[PDB]
């Protein structure tokens, strides 16, 4: 009868209940996510984003750039998938450093200094690791013939 | 109860007011006492809600203005009309249509001018004509100049008729508010009188006279020779040696048998092979149908006799779960706010002038339009402008309707609220597609440049390399080919040839041809997506914070034009929504002129040129849209640089006024700049020194001189800058195509 | 549960259990049977539109080379996308199990349309009973379609294009 | 209740082209620079709302509010100064007889002379 | 307290929790629908009604509005992640519009614009003209 | 925050306080002129900036001034 609602039942919060915002599937989805789930170490949360993104990231490279015609266009690709990576640690480390500060942290929440490295060093660990896995899936592709 | 209610002697006529201008506005009333006032009396003359506060008033000067514009119009037709029947080379291009040039301007000889007098042929020097009355009388059946000069003069008679209604209206017997709002009488009478009876009447004048006189035209009978119109009416015998189905006479219409009349209503499709043109008996057809199509139309709505639909009805009903209260108060809108009326209306009629340049140009209506490449170019761009401006002055009246007649009272809950209270989101959202469509669709262009410039051709997006198919128009393109014989099984040919089949070819020259699609049509596509996209997103901003924002709360109360809400805030410069209105025309006019760039080169490269008997094609610019039209380089080169070549190479010649016209529209366009680019603050400053000087001279005028607004000073940046883009694009088209005509 | 379900239950037939398959389950099972009748009824009406769209030959995709016959086409597609099918459907219903250890689930109820929403409301009940009615005539035409297309060789249109 | 809560602010008023701290100070004493949003079972920061089951909408919920107790108060509190004046000019109990008479909002709003008027009343 | 209000995207944000928040109270005599300053119409209720926003400016725009309705009684308070309060408006039950004894003036200078000092004056002395 | 400031050249007209929208502005007791008022603005922390109280006020030159300086949130006129 009525699929919208003020969000937390709270008309004057700049945000609606929607079925984009607050269906089952969207709630189940977002609450498995490592940025989210329970009970993760920081340094899992990190590995397993990691490992998500560098195992897609090596596909535009292997496939479009510049040397995707060589021979050696795949490990081009691969190269060209850890310097992304590389530049994309630089930006959480430096992220964490303005955000938190540099004193020691008070606690083990992903939101703190001490946290946020050790989720930077496993997503730069999962993220290479992951490049070098799609490196290796992507050196022999299977027809999946009998 | 549907009823007639008019005050009778509402107004007196007099000149009294003639001389106090500005009498409509009480501020404006009391007389100038700065140059503003006189700016202002321009500005809100037409204003009528801000000049009384009464809706039966406003509706009266709306319905007696509508008079004098109709009279405007008929005035302009009547002279249109005249120019062919006295200064054209008509009756001589009607012998040969294919090698006289169409002229209906002539220009007196003085300081020189008189070099505009091309040799157009026909014995006739003149201007040549790209607007189409030569196509357009031949197709309903004109063959004299004297039939134009009876036009002509109908015309006229019609333009006063439309003058004095306006006056009798206004002043003797003005409507009451009552009688405007009847919405569904309006409705049913514009539905099934003047769409449906109009067709009904279009249809027997193309059956009865305009069919037999381009039957024989086509075949070859002199106009000298054809009978006149009304022995068409009067010989049934005439008729008959031309359709035979005539001589059987109107006891097949009532007696159901209509496929008798399958000799003159037919369904070919395709193009008239002699002219060029759609056959006329497909259009009378077409026309039949549509007049029976409205008329129905035209009986869904409840008046007096119990029967119809009420709309506020229908509109109430039509509300979901997402929705809330739906539809309901929008017929209240629609029937108590002109502004609203308007912009759906100026929506509407916009995007329908846009179809209609694609229409027209794709399925050419008239005989010998097709290969006058002239005219097509400016029929499909003059109707591509109008329509641009339409559809944004429909969203500056949506923004005009929510400052002044919105009330939240009558809008609790319905859609307009929920819009109301989603904006963030869809703003956001907007803005999302408008980056995402711009980075990749100008982004293709930006890295072909670069690839090509690094002598990189291989790793362009282009046909010859990484290819972006528009697979999605090829199979619409495949499936409208296949049309005729099985999903349009009575057709006999395509609706139009652009989608494939043979080459159409009058005089020599093509009149249109398959119109194929690759890289570069998808990338310019999309570039189209783009420039919409961001115009919808400038005007829905200035439509859904029109009344308020997180910047400022009070919006409403500072109206539907301001300048600003001062350099606070960080700044509040064109917050309003008369400056979305303001920065969607620009927005307008870039996406405009891309889409008649795109239209005039891929129609030059691929479809209009000559075609030799044997069989060879030889395309007005060889087909360079494919490889050229991917890079800015080859647009900057090979369209603008290589087709300005004609209007800047005309001085001498009967086009020079056209390079003159193409000076002077740069000319004005940068002067625009400086309207835009500057502020009154700097102008009023030195003012003050000039009126020092006056006044060093015993002499200054008590009307103070004083720098234009702030919204003024926009509104003339942007008008000369349209002014000035629109008409340099215009002498370089005119130019070009007349050289390629 | 019988004195507790309400959607499925509509004219002609109302409660329609002639065998008796629902007598004395426990309201798990009966969730059970209720979310198998939807999750069947929905992939069937998928299948039958999916179906009806490649007999008549829109099927553009691979440049339109698969057979307009279904049960060829589905052993002319490569097992590549067979797997991703299979895969991609997995994930879904790992997502589906999640949601469905939740405190009141619905059966059936992805969307979690109980935020909103409950039985109370007559049009809801009579929306779920559309999806229902349409999942069920699914199911049958979906097996009758694919019997015609097996061993009556006629992979279209039997009912209504003799009519024109 | 602390009324200059407000004023003490980190924010140091520059020497020229700042109009500094006025009747209720600058700026929050709250640092607004505050961590994004954090996983199920963990707070972003001290007063944080707990987002429950979705943390990712965690700053959609609420942990200020103005109850009419707290509004009734700290109107008196901030006004103290103002009724103080008016009885001053008027002129304990006859601010308590005037106040519970015709209210505390209505007291503000009179004048000496008019409250010398209903003063006439008992 | 609230209004009768659907909810909207217009609300307060992240601020609102963690810098300061507004809130606006005031009586109606009646249900009448007014225009939420965020976007959006609302339900007044009869008696009190409370309203939370994200800036000064938005609660003064609803009062200027609610004096459309003839209610005079709204109050404005700022309100910090704390739970502290500040009364904000009227500040001392009258109309800053209508001259009240006991406020002091604030920020005057006894002379006509035109009298400020020069800038070169006061060159490296961390003044503005307008402040000396 | 900005500066505003009132010259004595104020005629109390209470335009300024009235066009103010984030109630910088009051009326203040004084005999400086014949309305026996004086503009005040005790809560310049609040003020945006927007000029309003200029283009209200009805003096030549103005008696109002705003002068803009440090800005603040509520001198942006944030919601965020
Ligand atoms: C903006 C439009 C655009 C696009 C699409 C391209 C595309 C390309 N460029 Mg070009 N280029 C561009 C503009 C663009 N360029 C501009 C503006 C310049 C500067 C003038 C260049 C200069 C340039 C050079 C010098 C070169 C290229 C090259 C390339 C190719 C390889 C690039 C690459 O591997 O990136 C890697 C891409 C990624 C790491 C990510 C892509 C984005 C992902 C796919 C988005 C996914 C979103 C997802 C769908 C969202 C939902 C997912 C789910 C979770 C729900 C590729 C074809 C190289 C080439 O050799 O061309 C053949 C090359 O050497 N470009
Ligand atoms: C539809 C609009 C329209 C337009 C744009 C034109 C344009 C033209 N006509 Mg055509 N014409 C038209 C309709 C139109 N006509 C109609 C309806 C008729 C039938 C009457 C004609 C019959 C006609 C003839 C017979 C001729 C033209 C000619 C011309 C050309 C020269 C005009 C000229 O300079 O006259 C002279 C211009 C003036 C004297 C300017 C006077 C302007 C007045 C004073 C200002 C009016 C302002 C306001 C209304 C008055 C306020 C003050 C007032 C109350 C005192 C020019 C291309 C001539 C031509 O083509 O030569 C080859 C020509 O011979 N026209
Ligand atoms: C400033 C406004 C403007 C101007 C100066 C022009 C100028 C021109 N128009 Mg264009 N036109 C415009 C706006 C304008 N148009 C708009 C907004 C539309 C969308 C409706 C059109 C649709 C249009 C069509 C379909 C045709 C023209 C044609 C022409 C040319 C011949 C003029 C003529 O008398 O034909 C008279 C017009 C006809 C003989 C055909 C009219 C057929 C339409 C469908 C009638 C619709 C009338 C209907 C009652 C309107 C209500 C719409 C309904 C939904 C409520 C001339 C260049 C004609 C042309 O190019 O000839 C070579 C032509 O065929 N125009
Ligand atoms: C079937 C009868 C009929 C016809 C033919 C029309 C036609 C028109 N009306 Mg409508 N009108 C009608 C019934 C009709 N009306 C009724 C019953 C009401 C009350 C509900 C209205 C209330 C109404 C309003 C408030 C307005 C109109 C307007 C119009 C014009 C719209 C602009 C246009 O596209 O003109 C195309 C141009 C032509 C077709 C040229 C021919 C014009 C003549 C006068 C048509 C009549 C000829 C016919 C033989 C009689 C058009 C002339 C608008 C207008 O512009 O008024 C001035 C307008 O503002 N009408
Ligand atoms: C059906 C068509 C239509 C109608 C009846 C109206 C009616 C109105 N408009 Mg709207 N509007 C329209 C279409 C329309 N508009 C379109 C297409 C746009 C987009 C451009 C707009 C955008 C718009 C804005 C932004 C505003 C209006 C406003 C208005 C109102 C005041 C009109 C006035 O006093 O101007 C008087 C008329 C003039 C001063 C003439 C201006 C001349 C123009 C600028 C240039 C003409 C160039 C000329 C053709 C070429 C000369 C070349 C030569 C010199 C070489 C009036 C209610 C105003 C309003 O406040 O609404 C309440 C307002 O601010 N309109
Ligand atoms: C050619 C000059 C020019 C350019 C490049 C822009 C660009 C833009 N305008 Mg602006 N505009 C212009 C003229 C221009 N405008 C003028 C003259 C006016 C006055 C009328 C305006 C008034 C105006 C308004 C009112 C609005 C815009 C908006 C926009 C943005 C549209 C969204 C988008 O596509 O972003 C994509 C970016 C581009 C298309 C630019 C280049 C993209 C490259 C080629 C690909 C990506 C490269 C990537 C970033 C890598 C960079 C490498 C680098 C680090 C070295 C875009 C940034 C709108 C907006 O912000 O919407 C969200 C908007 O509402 N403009
Ligand atoms: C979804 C409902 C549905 C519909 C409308 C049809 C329709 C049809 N069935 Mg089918 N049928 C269906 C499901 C359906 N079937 C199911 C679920 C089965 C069990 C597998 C069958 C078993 C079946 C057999 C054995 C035969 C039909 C046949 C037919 C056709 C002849 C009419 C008839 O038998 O009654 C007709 C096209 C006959 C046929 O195929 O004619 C060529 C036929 O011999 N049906
Ligand atoms: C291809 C054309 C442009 C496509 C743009 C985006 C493609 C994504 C698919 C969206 C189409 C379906 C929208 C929801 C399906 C739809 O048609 O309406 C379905 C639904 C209608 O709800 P009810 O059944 O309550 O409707 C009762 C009706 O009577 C309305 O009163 O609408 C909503 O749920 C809210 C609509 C906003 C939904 C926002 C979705 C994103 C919109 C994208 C922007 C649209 C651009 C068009 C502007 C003119
Ligand atoms: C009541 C629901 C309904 C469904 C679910 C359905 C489904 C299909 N129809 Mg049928 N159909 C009607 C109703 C339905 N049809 C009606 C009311 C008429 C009279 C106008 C009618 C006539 C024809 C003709 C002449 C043909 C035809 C076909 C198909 C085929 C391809 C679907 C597509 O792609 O559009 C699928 C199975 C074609 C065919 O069988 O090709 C081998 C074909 O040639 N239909
Ligand atoms: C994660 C992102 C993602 C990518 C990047 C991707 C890409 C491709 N998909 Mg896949 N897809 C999913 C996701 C993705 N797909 C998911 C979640 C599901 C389950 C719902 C799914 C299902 C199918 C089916 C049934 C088919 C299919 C195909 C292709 C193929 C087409 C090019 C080609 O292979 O020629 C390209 C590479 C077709 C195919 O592989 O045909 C042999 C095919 O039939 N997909
Ligand atoms: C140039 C310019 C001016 C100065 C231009 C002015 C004042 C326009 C002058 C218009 C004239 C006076 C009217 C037309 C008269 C002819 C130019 C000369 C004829 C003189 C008499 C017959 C009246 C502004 O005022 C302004 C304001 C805001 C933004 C940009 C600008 C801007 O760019
Ligand atoms: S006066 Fe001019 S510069 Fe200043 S805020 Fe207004 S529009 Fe902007």
Redesign the interface.
């Given at each position: 009868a009525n699929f919208i609602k003020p969000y937390n039942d709270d008309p004057f919060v700049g945000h609606l209940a929607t079925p984009i915002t607050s269906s089952s599937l969207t709630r189940a989805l977002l609450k498995n996510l490592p940025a989210y789930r329970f009970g993760l170490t920081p340094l899992l949360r990190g590995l397993e984003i990691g490992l998500a993104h560098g195992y897609f990231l090596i596909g535009p490279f292997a496939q479009l750039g510049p040397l995707r015609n060589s021979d050696i266009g795949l490990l081009a690709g691969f190269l060209s998938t850890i310097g992304l990576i590389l530049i994309l640690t630089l930006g959480l480390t430096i992220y964490g450093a303005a955000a938190f500060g540099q004193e020691k942290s008070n606690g083990s929440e992903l939101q703190t200094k001490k946290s946020w490295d050790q989720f930077k060093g496993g997503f730069f660990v999962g993220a290479c690791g992951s490049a070098g896995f799609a490196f290796i899936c992507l050196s022999s592709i299977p027809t999946f013939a009998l | 109860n549907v009823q007639v209610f008019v005050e009778k002697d509402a107004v007196e006529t007099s000149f009294a007011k003639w001389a106090q201008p500005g009498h409509f506005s009480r501020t404006l009333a009391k007389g100038p006492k700065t140059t503003t006032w006189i700016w202002n009396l321009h500005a809100d003359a037409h204003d009528f809600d801000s000049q009384t506060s009464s809706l039966e008033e406003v509706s009266r000067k709306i319905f007696s203005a509508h008079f004098g514009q109709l009279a405007i119009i008929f005035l302009w037709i009547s002279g249109m009309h005249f120019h062919g029947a006295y200064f054209s080379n008509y009756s001589a291009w009607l012998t040969d249509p294919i090698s006289i040039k169409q002229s209906s301007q002539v220009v007196w000889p003085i300081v020189g001018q008189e070099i505009l007098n091309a040799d157009v042929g026909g014995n006739f020097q003149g201007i040549q004509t790209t607007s189409g009355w030569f196509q357009m009388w031949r197709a309903e059946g004109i063959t004299s100049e004297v039939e134009l000069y009876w036009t002509a003069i109908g015309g006229l008679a019609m333009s006063a008729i439309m003058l004095f209604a306006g006056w009798f209206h206004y002043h003797k017997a003005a409507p009451k508010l009552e009688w405007f709002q009847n919405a569904e009488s309006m409705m049913n009478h514009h539905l099934a009188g003047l769409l449906g009876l109009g067709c009904l009447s279009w249809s027997g004048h193309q059956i009865h006279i305009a069919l037999p006189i381009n039957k024989l035209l086509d075949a070859g009978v002199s106009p000298q020779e054809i009978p006149l119109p009304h022995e068409f009416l009067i010989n049934r015998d005439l008729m008959a040696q031309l359709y035979p189905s005539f001589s059987k006479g109107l006891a097949p219409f009532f007696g159901g048998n209509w496929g008798e009349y399958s000799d003159f209503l037919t369904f070919k499709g395709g193009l008239n092979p002699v002219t060029g043109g759609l056959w006329l008996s497909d259009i009378a057809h077409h026309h039949l149908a549509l007049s029976v199509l409205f008329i129905i139309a035209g009986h869904m709505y409840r008046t007096n006799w119990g029967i119809g639909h009420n709309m506020k009805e229908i509109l109430e009903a039509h509300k979901g779960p997402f929705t809330g209260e739906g539809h309901k108060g929008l017929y209240e809108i629609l029937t108590t706010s002109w502004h609203a009326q308007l912009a759906i209306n100026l929506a509407m009629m916009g995007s329908l002038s846009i179809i209609v340049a694609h229409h027209m140009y794709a399925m050419p209506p008239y005989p010998y339009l097709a290969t006058d490449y002239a005219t097509q170019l400016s029929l499909f761009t003059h109707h591509m402008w109008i329509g641009g401006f339409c559809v944004v002055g429909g969203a500056a009246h949506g923004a005009i309707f929510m400052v002044r007649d919105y009330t939240p009272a009558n809008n609790y809950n319905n859609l307009l609220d929920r819009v109301l209270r989603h904006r963030d989101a869809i703003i956001s959202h907007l803005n999302w597609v408008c980056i995402f469509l711009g980075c990749h669709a100008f982004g293709f262009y930006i890295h072909n440049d670069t690839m090509r410039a690094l002598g990189r051709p291989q790793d362009m997006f282009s046909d010859k390399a990484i290819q972006l198919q528009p697979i999605f128009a090829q199979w619409i393109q495949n499936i409208h080919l296949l049309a005729p014989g099985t999903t349009a099984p009575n057709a006999l040919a395509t609706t139009s040839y652009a989608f494939g089949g043979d080459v159409i070819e009058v005089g020599g020259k093509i009149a249109m041809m398959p119109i194929k699609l690759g890289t570069a049509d998808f990338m310019v596509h999309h570039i189209h997506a783009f420039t919409i996209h961001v115009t919808v997103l400038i005007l829905l901003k200035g439509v859904l914070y029109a009344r308020s924002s997180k910047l400022i709360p009070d919006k409403a109360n500072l109206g539907f034009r301001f300048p600003c809400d001062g350099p606070g805030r960080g700044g509040t410069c064109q917050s309003s929504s008369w400056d979305h209105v303001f920065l969607g025309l620009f927005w307008m006019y870039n996406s405009i002129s891309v889409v008649i760039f795109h239209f005039s080169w891929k129609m030059q490269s691929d479809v209009w040129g000559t075609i030799t008997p044997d069989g060879a094609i030889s395309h007005i610019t060889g087909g360079n849209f494919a490889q050229s039209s991917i890079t800015i380089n080859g647009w900057l080169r090979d369209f603008l640089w290589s087709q300005a070549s004609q209007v800047i190479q005309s001085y001498g010649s009967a086009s020079s006024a056209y390079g003159l016209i193409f000076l002077g529209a740069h000319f004005i366009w940068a002067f625009s700049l400086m309207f835009l680019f500057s502020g009154r603050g700097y102008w009023q400053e030195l003012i003050e020194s000039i009126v020092w000087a006056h006044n060093k001279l015993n002499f200054a005028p008590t009307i103070q001189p004083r720098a234009l607004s702030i919204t003024q000073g926009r509104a003339v940046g942007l008008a000369h800058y349209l002014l000035g883009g629109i008409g340099t694009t215009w002498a370089f088209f005119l130019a070009r195509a007349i050289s390629i005509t | 549960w019988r004195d507790e379900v309400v959607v499925g239950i509509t004219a002609p037939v109302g409660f329609f259990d002639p065998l008796g398959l629902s007598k004395g389950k426990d309201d798990a099972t009966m969730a059970y049977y209720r979310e198998a009748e939807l999750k069947n009824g929905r992939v069937a009406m998928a299948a039958c539109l999916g179906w009806y769209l490649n007999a008549g030959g829109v099927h553009p995709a691979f440049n339109s080379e698969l057979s307009n016959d279904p049960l060829k086409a589905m052993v002319e597609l490569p097992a590549v996308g067979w797997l991703q099918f299979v895969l991609g459907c997995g994930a879904i219903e790992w997502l589906g199990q999640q949601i469905k250890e939740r405190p009141g689930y619905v059966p059936g109820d992805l969307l979690g349309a109980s935020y909103w929403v409950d039985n109370s409301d007559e049009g809801w009940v009579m929306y779920q009973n559309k999806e229902l009615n349409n999942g069920r005539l699914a199911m049958l035409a979906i097996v009758g379609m694919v019997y015609q297309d097996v061993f009556v060789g006629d992979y279209g249109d039997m009912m209504y294009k003799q009519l024109v | 209740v602390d009324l200059d809560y407000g004023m003490k602010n980190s924010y140091v008023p520059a020497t020229g082209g700042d109009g500094g701290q006025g009747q209720f100070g600058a700026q929050s004493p709250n640092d607004w620079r505050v961590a994004g949003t954090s996983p199920v079972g963990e707070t972003s920061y001290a007063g944080a709302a707990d987002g429950g089951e979705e943390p990712w909408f965690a700053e959609a919920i609420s942990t200020v509010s103005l109850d009419l107790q707290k509004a009734d108060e700290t109107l008196k509190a901030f006004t103290k100064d103002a009724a103080a004046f008016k009885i001053e000019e008027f002129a304990d109990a006859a601010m308590e007889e005037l106040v519970g008479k015709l209210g505390y909002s209505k007291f503000l709003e009179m004048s000496t002379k008019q409250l010398m008027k209903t003063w006439g009343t008992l | 307290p609230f209004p009768t209000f659907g909810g909207s995207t217009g609300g307060w944000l992240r601020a609102a929790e963690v810098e300061e928040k507004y809130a606006i109270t005031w009586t109606s005599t009646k249900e009448q629908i007014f225009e939420m300053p965020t976007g959006g119409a609302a339900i007044m209720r009869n008696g009190e009604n409370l309203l939370y926003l994200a800036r000064k400016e938005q609660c003064l725009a609803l009062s200027t509005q609610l004096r459309t309705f003839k209610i005079n009684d709204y109050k404005i308070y700022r309100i910090f992640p704390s739970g502290e309060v500040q009364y904000l408006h009227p500040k001392d039950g009258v109309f800053p519009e209508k001259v009240n004894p006991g406020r002091t003036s604030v920020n005057s200078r006894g002379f006509s614009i035109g009298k400020n000092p020069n800038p070169a004056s006061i060159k490296f002395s961390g003044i503005t003209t307008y402040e000396s | 925050?900005?500066?505003?400031?009132?010259?004595?050249?104020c005629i109390?007209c209470?335009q300024c306080?009235?066009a103010?929208?984030?109630?910088v502005?009051?009326?203040?007791?004084?005999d400086g002129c014949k309305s026996?008022?004086?503009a005040?603005?005790?809560?310049?922390?609040?003020?945006?900036?927007?000029?309003?109280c200029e283009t209200a006020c009805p003096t030549d030159?103005?008696?109002v001034?705003?002068?803009?300086?440090?800005?603040?949130?509520?001198?942006?006129?944030?919601?965020?």
């Amino acid at each position: 009868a009525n699929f919208i609602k003020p969000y937390n039942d709270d008309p004057f919060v700049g945000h609606l209940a929607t079925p984009i915002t607050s269906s089952s599937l969207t709630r189940a989805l977002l609450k498995n996510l490592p940025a989210y789930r329970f009970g993760l170490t920081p340094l899992l949360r990190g590995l397993e984003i990691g490992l998500a993104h560098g195992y897609f990231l090596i596909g535009p490279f292997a496939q479009l750039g510049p040397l995707r015609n060589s021979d050696i266009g795949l490990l081009a690709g691969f190269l060209s998938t850890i310097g992304l990576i590389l530049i994309l640690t630089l930006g959480l480390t430096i992220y964490g450093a303005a955000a938190f500060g540099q004193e020691k942290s008070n606690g083990s929440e992903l939101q703190t200094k001490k946290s946020w490295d050790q989720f930077k060093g496993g997503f730069f660990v999962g993220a290479c690791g992951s490049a070098g896995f799609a490196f290796i899936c992507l050196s022999s592709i299977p027809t999946f013939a009998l | 109860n549907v009823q007639v209610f008019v005050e009778k002697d509402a107004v007196e006529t007099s000149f009294a007011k003639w001389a106090q201008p500005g009498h409509f506005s009480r501020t404006l009333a009391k007389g100038p006492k700065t140059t503003t006032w006189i700016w202002n009396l321009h500005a809100d003359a037409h204003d009528f809600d801000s000049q009384t506060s009464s809706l039966e008033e406003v509706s009266r000067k709306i319905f007696s203005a509508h008079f004098g514009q109709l009279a405007i119009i008929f005035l302009w037709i009547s002279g249109m009309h005249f120019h062919g029947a006295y200064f054209s080379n008509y009756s001589a291009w009607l012998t040969d249509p294919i090698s006289i040039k169409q002229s209906s301007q002539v220009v007196w000889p003085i300081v020189g001018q008189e070099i505009l007098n091309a040799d157009v042929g026909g014995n006739f020097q003149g201007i040549q004509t790209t607007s189409g009355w030569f196509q357009m009388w031949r197709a309903e059946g004109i063959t004299s100049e004297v039939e134009l000069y009876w036009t002509a003069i109908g015309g006229l008679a019609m333009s006063a008729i439309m003058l004095f209604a306006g006056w009798f209206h206004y002043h003797k017997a003005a409507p009451k508010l009552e009688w405007f709002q009847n919405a569904e009488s309006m409705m049913n009478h514009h539905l099934a009188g003047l769409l449906g009876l109009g067709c009904l009447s279009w249809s027997g004048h193309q059956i009865h006279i305009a069919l037999p006189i381009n039957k024989l035209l086509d075949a070859g009978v002199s106009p000298q020779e054809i009978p006149l119109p009304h022995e068409f009416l009067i010989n049934r015998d005439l008729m008959a040696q031309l359709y035979p189905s005539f001589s059987k006479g109107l006891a097949p219409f009532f007696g159901g048998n209509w496929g008798e009349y399958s000799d003159f209503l037919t369904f070919k499709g395709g193009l008239n092979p002699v002219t060029g043109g759609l056959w006329l008996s497909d259009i009378a057809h077409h026309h039949l149908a549509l007049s029976v199509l409205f008329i129905i139309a035209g009986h869904m709505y409840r008046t007096n006799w119990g029967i119809g639909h009420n709309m506020k009805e229908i509109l109430e009903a039509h509300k979901g779960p997402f929705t809330g209260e739906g539809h309901k108060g929008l017929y209240e809108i629609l029937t108590t706010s002109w502004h609203a009326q308007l912009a759906i209306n100026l929506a509407m009629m916009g995007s329908l002038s846009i179809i209609v340049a694609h229409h027209m140009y794709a399925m050419p209506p008239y005989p010998y339009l097709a290969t006058d490449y002239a005219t097509q170019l400016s029929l499909f761009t003059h109707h591509m402008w109008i329509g641009g401006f339409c559809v944004v002055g429909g969203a500056a009246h949506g923004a005009i309707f929510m400052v002044r007649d919105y009330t939240p009272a009558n809008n609790y809950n319905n859609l307009l609220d929920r819009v109301l209270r989603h904006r963030d989101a869809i703003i956001s959202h907007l803005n999302w597609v408008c980056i995402f469509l711009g980075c990749h669709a100008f982004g293709f262009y930006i890295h072909n440049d670069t690839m090509r410039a690094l002598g990189r051709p291989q790793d362009m997006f282009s046909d010859k390399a990484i290819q972006l198919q528009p697979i999605f128009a090829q199979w619409i393109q495949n499936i409208h080919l296949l049309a005729p014989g099985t999903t349009a099984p009575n057709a006999l040919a395509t609706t139009s040839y652009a989608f494939g089949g043979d080459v159409i070819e009058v005089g020599g020259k093509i009149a249109m041809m398959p119109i194929k699609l690759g890289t570069a049509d998808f990338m310019v596509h999309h570039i189209h997506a783009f420039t919409i996209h961001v115009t919808v997103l400038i005007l829905l901003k200035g439509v859904l914070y029109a009344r308020s924002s997180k910047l400022i709360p009070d919006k409403a109360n500072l109206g539907f034009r301001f300048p600003c809400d001062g350099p606070g805030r960080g700044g509040t410069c064109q917050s309003s929504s008369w400056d979305h209105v303001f920065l969607g025309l620009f927005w307008m006019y870039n996406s405009i002129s891309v889409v008649i760039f795109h239209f005039s080169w891929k129609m030059q490269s691929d479809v209009w040129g000559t075609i030799t008997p044997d069989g060879a094609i030889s395309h007005i610019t060889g087909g360079n849209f494919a490889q050229s039209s991917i890079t800015i380089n080859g647009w900057l080169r090979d369209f603008l640089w290589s087709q300005a070549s004609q209007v800047i190479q005309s001085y001498g010649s009967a086009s020079s006024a056209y390079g003159l016209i193409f000076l002077g529209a740069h000319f004005i366009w940068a002067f625009s700049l400086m309207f835009l680019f500057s502020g009154r603050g700097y102008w009023q400053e030195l003012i003050e020194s000039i009126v020092w000087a006056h006044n060093k001279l015993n002499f200054a005028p008590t009307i103070q001189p004083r720098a234009l607004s702030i919204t003024q000073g926009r509104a003339v940046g942007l008008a000369h800058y349209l002014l000035g883009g629109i008409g340099t694009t215009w002498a370089f088209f005119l130019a070009r195509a007349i050289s390629i005509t | 549960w019988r004195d507790e379900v309400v959607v499925g239950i509509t004219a002609p037939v109302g409660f329609f259990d002639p065998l008796g398959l629902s007598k004395g389950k426990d309201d798990a099972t009966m969730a059970y049977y209720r979310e198998a009748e939807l999750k069947n009824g929905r992939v069937a009406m998928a299948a039958c539109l999916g179906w009806y769209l490649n007999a008549g030959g829109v099927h553009p995709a691979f440049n339109s080379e698969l057979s307009n016959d279904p049960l060829k086409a589905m052993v002319e597609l490569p097992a590549v996308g067979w797997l991703q099918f299979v895969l991609g459907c997995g994930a879904i219903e790992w997502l589906g199990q999640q949601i469905k250890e939740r405190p009141g689930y619905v059966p059936g109820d992805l969307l979690g349309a109980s935020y909103w929403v409950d039985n109370s409301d007559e049009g809801w009940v009579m929306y779920q009973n559309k999806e229902l009615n349409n999942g069920r005539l699914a199911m049958l035409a979906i097996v009758g379609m694919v019997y015609q297309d097996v061993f009556v060789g006629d992979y279209g249109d039997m009912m209504y294009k003799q009519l024109v | 209740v602390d009324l200059d809560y407000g004023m003490k602010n980190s924010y140091v008023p520059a020497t020229g082209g700042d109009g500094g701290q006025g009747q209720f100070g600058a700026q929050s004493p709250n640092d607004w620079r505050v961590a994004g949003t954090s996983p199920v079972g963990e707070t972003s920061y001290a007063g944080a709302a707990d987002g429950g089951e979705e943390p990712w909408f965690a700053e959609a919920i609420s942990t200020v509010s103005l109850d009419l107790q707290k509004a009734d108060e700290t109107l008196k509190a901030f006004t103290k100064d103002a009724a103080a004046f008016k009885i001053e000019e008027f002129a304990d109990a006859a601010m308590e007889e005037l106040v519970g008479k015709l209210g505390y909002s209505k007291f503000l709003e009179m004048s000496t002379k008019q409250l010398m008027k209903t003063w006439g009343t008992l | 307290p609230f209004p009768t209000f659907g909810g909207s995207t217009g609300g307060w944000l992240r601020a609102a929790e963690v810098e300061e928040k507004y809130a606006i109270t005031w009586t109606s005599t009646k249900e009448q629908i007014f225009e939420m300053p965020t976007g959006g119409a609302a339900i007044m209720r009869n008696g009190e009604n409370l309203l939370y926003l994200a800036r000064k400016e938005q609660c003064l725009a609803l009062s200027t509005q609610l004096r459309t309705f003839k209610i005079n009684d709204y109050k404005i308070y700022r309100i910090f992640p704390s739970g502290e309060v500040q009364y904000l408006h009227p500040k001392d039950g009258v109309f800053p519009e209508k001259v009240n004894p006991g406020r002091t003036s604030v920020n005057s200078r006894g002379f006509s614009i035109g009298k400020n000092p020069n800038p070169a004056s006061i060159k490296f002395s961390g003044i503005t003209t307008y402040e000396s | 925050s900005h500066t505003v400031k009132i010259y004595d050249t104020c005629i109390g007209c209470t335009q300024c306080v009235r066009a103010c929208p984030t109630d910088v502005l009051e009326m203040v007791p004084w005999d400086g002129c014949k309305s026996g008022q004086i503009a005040s603005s005790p809560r310049v922390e609040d003020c945006v900036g927007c000029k309003r109280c200029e283009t209200a006020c009805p003096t030549d030159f103005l008696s109002v001034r705003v002068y803009l300086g440090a800005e603040t949130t509520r001198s942006l006129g944030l919601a965020y």
